[PDB]
XYZ file of C-alpha atoms in Angstrom:
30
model
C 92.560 103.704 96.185
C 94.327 101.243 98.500
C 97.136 102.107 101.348
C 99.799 103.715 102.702
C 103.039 102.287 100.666
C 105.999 102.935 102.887
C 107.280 99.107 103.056
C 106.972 98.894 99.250
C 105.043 100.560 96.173
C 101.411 99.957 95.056
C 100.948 98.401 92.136
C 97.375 99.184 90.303
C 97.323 102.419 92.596
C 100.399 103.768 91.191
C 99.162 103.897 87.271
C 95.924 105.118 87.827
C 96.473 106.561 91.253
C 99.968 107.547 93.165
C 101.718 106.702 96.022
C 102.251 109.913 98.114
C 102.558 110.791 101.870
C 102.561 107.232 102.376
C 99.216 106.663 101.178
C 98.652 105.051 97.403
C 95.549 107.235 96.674
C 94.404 109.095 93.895
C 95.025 112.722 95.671
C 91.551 112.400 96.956
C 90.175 109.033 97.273
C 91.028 106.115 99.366
């Protein structure tokens, strides 16, 4: 969905998609 969100938390990625394992991706897509 976007990126890795260890500096700070994703924004549009973290409605729809969510920030885990530093990555802000919907479980499954980038």
């Amino acid at each position: 969905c976007g990126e890795s969100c260890v500096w700070i938390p994703c924004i549009s990625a973290a409605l729809g998609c969510s920030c885990k394992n530093k990555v802000c991706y919907r479980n499954g897509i980038p």
